[PDB]
Structures are given as structure tokens and as C-alpha cells.
Design a protein around this ligand. Sequence first.
Ligand code: NAG
Ligand code: NAG
Lengths: 416, 416
Amino acid sequence: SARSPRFGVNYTPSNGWFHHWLDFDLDAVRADLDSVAALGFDHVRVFPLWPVFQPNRTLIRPRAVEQLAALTDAAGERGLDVNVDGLQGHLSSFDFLPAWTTTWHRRNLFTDPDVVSGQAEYLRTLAAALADRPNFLGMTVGNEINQFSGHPHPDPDRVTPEQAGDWLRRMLDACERGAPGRLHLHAEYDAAWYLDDHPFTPAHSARIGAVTAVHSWVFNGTAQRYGTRSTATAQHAAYLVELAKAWAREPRRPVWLQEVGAPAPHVPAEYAAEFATATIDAVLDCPEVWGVTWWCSHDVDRRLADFPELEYSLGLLTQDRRVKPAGRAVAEAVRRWRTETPAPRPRTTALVVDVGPGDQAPARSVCAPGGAVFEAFMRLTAQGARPTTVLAEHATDADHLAARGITEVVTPHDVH
Amino acid sequence: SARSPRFGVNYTPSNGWFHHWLDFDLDAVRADLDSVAALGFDHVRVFPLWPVFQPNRTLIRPRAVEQLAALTDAAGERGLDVNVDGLQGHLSSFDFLPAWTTTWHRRNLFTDPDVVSGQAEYLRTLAAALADRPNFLGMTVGNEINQFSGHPHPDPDRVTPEQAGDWLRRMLDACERGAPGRLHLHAEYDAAWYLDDHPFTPAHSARIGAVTAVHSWVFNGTAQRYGTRSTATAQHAAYLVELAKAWAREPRRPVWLQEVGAPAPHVPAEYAAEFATATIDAVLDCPEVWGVTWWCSHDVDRRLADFPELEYSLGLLTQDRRVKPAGRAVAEAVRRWRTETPAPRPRTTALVVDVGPGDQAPARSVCAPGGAVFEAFMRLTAQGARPTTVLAEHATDADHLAARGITEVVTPHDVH
Ligand SMILES: CC(=O)N[C@@H]1[C@@H](O)[C@H](O)[C@@H](CO)O[C@H]1O
Ligand SMILES: CC(=O)N[C@@H]1[C@@H](O)[C@H](O)[C@@H](CO)O[C@H]1O
């Protein structure tokens, strides 16, 4: 009954980046997706710009929607399924916020009834427009929208965890209404697991939406503390996968590694291929992985200003559509895992994750790089123990353990 | 040598409002400008959306520029000259701010060297693209950009007056560089004359840029304090014209009434025609008026949300291009003033304007509705004295007075 992982890329348009919606060129998209499918991927994750699609609360532009459908059709012709992220929102250090949510109309993104009603109509419209596309996977509410909810954001839209979970439900309700039965989820960046009192929580990620989405980025302190060529750096995606399982109510709830990339300087370009192989191999030794989706397809145009340096070189391909060695290595790992490798065995040893109550997760920073749970997991991993995780409050739950096939339970104090 | 006033409208596209740049339709623009020229106007004031034209600091979209040129050409065919406002920025309660100026990239609009360098390139590019258009008037830096500089803005980019004047110079330098010899100016809303310690000052408006631009809006407290059918309400545009002259170094520096409109409920629709006639008649009794430019050509689409109620009905035409009675009245006033009315006589009586030092204007609120200078001017006007204004520091300057033809000088204390 073992789950079979899918392989895709986050689509970063080579001509004009996500600004290409302002000058939409289907032939340029066709060429981008051509070089994507030639690498053997089976899906793309694609990004509308929210204020370009909804420049006024009650103006959702049909032409923008039509363009998204044409993109989805071009991908379908090429054997690529499409997940669409709705609320961007945040992309690569930039916040794209509609004028009707800011300054003179500043209205909290998660709690204002008019903005939330506008967000719902937006998501529902996209989902409904794509509902007749057989290659349309479903919606992700918005890329790492939790980054708006608190520190370190310079101007956050603050919310309680209950408010955040309620907002997520309404957003996913809208996706479900536009495209019933599709794969609708939300995706939060790693503050949801690592930052104490961050409003978006691990329970939100593991108990709302169809699958848990994780974004694995070793610039978060991991590569800095442990080195580029290290257990922790190579295993960081696998760790996020197994950590996220602890809060899941369903024992076989899949986990989607929706973002993973090789950020220089933390991963120099010369080590990107090697890093990509080890990371993919390591995470695919985890059961129930829904898929691996690399960030990103194409380098960002170097004529575009003010990106953090790491953002420019994250592509599997260059801006002129040449395949990088790291692109070649990911394609090779995809090919090997689709055909030549067996399913991963169950992880029967569980590391106890004690995070405080854990619905609220007030001390989740023990899971962050340098934390006791983090280092206990990498130590076990290095010892060959192939660990999963379990919450302290379920660590003696014979039904939880047996449902998961867990036969051994250890704490970080046990690991030392 | 008397100056002859021009007549135009602020172009508010009927299909999609200023969001029409996202779905640019030249035939829809042609039809809009057709109904404009049929009313007898000779120019339009037109508004790019800054973040649509410059979505990234070093991406100024050539297609957006091409669209602006096609709009300018369509207008030229119809005998309409074009002023282009650059930095929007602010339009009708909405702030359109590029992602590269906000939150994670928050960089002060008036002082950050990278943003200011980006603004310069933007203005220079627009001006240069239109420089070969014989109907291209010139640039206005940006619509009421001073609203970003302080209270009551909820999130201002604060600046000292010296910083604001320096920024204006650099912005106009860029316009001049792209289109030498053209009519380049800046336009600040009435806080520049009315709000104590507002960073943009009357000296900035009267001593930087080719002409002084004023925006006359009787919802600023005037209609509320004095009534819709009153001297002060009818004369408010004329007052702003004559007030703005006090800070001018050149005695014949023209003043452009770049915005004037009839906002309901302060001016009910049934009184818009009558209000428009009286306002135009009153301001055109002021010498050196560069022109009168009505806000706006077309009602805002009522399907667009979150505008202040007054914004929807400010058009001379409805959203379906029917001419309103107020449109008919403005066209009639234009026709009469172009052919049937003599030039206004000089205003030889000057009201003293004591504002504190006045370069800095720390007590300019004496010019605001309810202020001593304001009410002294309306009282003189009602008495038939046809007043101009003079700064306290120049009130005994025999050369200033004679250069202006001023033969009588009175203070508000004199008027009582
Ligand atoms: C402010 C900032 O740059 N935040 C980044 C975000 O852009 C990125 O998507 C995320 C990936 O995990 O990492 C965050 O640290
Ligand atoms: C915050 C706000 O609505 N400000 C308005 C502005 O939209 C308008 O252009 C201006 C005209 O003078 O009047 C201001 O009061």
C-alpha cells in the first residue's frame, strides 16, 4: 500500500519572472515548460500575482484567469499537472499586496470580513476556471502566507492561532467550492515549526488541507551551524517531513516537499548537484512522501533588481534555458527513483517531540536548527536509526504507535 | 500680454478605470477620448499606474510605455494635448506602491537613493518616449505625491521640507532630460497650503516646476463650513489660484487649476451644473490661469469596490459615455470663455498672507477653511474687491507690488 512520490518544479518564468502576467507570452511559457518536461518532471507549481489578477476587490480579471488556463493547457499538452498557488502575496522577499488591503484601506489579511470575502472569491474563481482541466491538481491557498502573520515581518497582520486556522478553513472551503474533490492545501514556511508563538502552527499544517506541505531551506541556520557537507544539511528535508508527521491525525497523511532548493553561498553552485542527490535520496527514504517539487525551474533574470543574491541562481536551468549540472542531477535522481529503487521501509523508531501543549506549540523552537529535537534527530539519523517523530502527548499511545508501526520510542535526553 | 486659459479633463478610463493598463484596449480609449473631444476640451491629463509600468526597480515595461504612446497618439488625432502624471502612487483613496518600495524593501519614497534613482529613470523614460509626440505637453511628477509625506497618512514616508524640495528638483531634472523644453511640473494637494508643518510647502509649489498646480476640492471643509451655495464654496478654486501666487518669484508665473470637480453630497448632482459654471466663471476672473482641467471625464464603474462614495459620480460623463448636465454646462462655459468673454482685469487689491516665515509656512492653516486669511479673502470677494494675495514679508515691497500691479494692500485685521 506504499505511497509513490511525484516529481515536479516550481515554475519561475524565464522572461520577466512572475511579472510575465503583465506581458503574457504563451510561446515563452511553452518553451519554458518544454525544458521542464524534457527533464522528466510530471508537474509544475505556478504562481499568479494576486494584485494583477484582483487589482480591485470586485475586479477579478477574466483575461488573467484565461491566461492561467492557457498556461495550464500548455502544461497539460506536455504531460505536466498543475498546482496553482493563489495568494501571492509573498515571493522571493517581495510582498505583492493589492492596493485595497493597504494604507488608506489597510485591512487585516486574515480577519477583515471584506478582504477575506475578496480572497475567497478569488480562490474560488481560479479553482472553478480550472475545474474542467484534467491536469489541474488543485490549489495551494498562498505561498508561505504565514510570513505576513508575525515577527520577523516588518509590518505584520497579527492573528491568534485560532484566527489563523479559521481563516485557512474558509480559504480551503472556497477552493473546494470552485473545484470539488481536487487537491487543495495550504503551505507555510518553516516558522510554523521553528518559531515560538508563531500564529501558524504545526497542527494547522498537518490537520487542515489535503496534505501537509513543507518548504525545506538550509539557509535557515542549518547550513550555517552544521556546514554545507553535513548530515543535518543533507537531511533537512527528510527531517521536516518526519517532524510534520507528529501532528497528523491520519497515520498515512502524505507530506509534500513542495519547495526544496540549493541556495548559494550556503550551497555553492559546485556542490548543488551533489547536494540535490543527497537531499532527494534522504527525503525519499521517508514513507508517505506525496512528491518532491524543486525550487526552481529557471534562474531569475539578473537584470531584475533587489532580490537577495541567493534568489538569482536557484534554477535547475539558467535564464536562457541551458540545463545546469544540478538540473542534470535532479533529472537523474527522478529517473532512478521512478523505476530503480524500492519503497522505503517503515520508520519504527520515533523521537519524542516535546513542544509544550503542541496544538499551540509554545516551545517549538526545540525543533529549530540547534534545538534539542533537531540535533537528536540528526544524531539518530547519522547512527542509522532512520527516525520518525512522535509528540510527547502521544508517545505512550499504544493505538497511535501501532497505527504508525512504531516499535521504539526515544527522547532527546535518551540520545543525550 | 494677457494669458489665455486652456480647457481639459482628467481622463478616468470608463472600462476598468486606471486598471485598464492591465487589459489595454485602444478602441475603448478611442471612444472615451471621442466623447471628451466632442465636449470641446483641448487636453487630457492621464495616469499610468507606477507599479504596473515599473513592477521591478529595473523593469520599466516597454509595452506599457508603448501603450502610453498609443494613447497619446489617439488623443493627438482628436486634437487633444496630453499631460502625463508619473508617480501614482495615489489615486482616489488608493495607494499604488511597487513591491520594491514596501515591507521587506521599505525604502523612503523621497530620500532613498535606490528608489529615487528608480523614480528618475521611470520619469525620464516616459518623457523620452513621448518626446517625439507634438501633442505631448510634459510631465507632472506624480498626482498629489505629498500625501505620502506626513499626517494624516497612516504610514507616511516622512521628509523635511528641504528634502522634499531637493527630491522635486531631481524628479523634474529627469523629466527635463527625457523631454527638454516641455511643460514639466509637480502637483501637491491642498495640505501644501493648509496644513501646518506639512513637508511640502507653498514655496515648493510656486518656485519648483514650470507652473503652479492646484487641486480645488470643496469637500476639504469648505462646503461643510460655509454651505454648498456660498461665496466660499463657489470661489474656492479662485482663492487657491490667488493664494498660490503669493509665493511666486515670477509675477506672471501661471497657475494651473489642474483638478476641480463637484463632489457629492457636498455638491449634490442637481447642483453640479450650477456649481461648475460659478466655479469656472470665478476662477477665470483671475489673471494668469494656465488652464482649467475638470475631474473627471467619466464616472468610475460602480462595480468597483471600496472607493469613497464621492469618487463614483465625479465624471462629466457616465460610465456608459452619456453626457451629464454638468458635462453640458462645462462645455458651455468652455465655449463662452474661448470666444465671448474678455480677459480678466488685474487684481490691484492684495490681502496680506502672514503665515510665519513662509518659506517654511509654520502657520499656513490661517489659509485653510475657517482661517483668518481664508475668510478675509471670501469677505473681500463678496464685497466686490476682486482680491489677490501678498506675503507679509513682501507686503511693503514697492518692487513686488508694482511688478504685480498691486495698488492697495489690506490685512485680515483690516477686513475684520
Ligand atoms: C523575509 C524573507 O526573505 N523570507 C524568506 C522567504 O522569502 C522565503 O520564501 C522563505 C523560504 O523558507 O524563507 C524566508 O526566510
Ligand atoms: C486620504 C484621501 O482620501 N485623500 C484625498 C485624496 O484622495 C484626494 O486626491 C485629495 C484631493 O484634494 O483629497 C484628499 O483628501
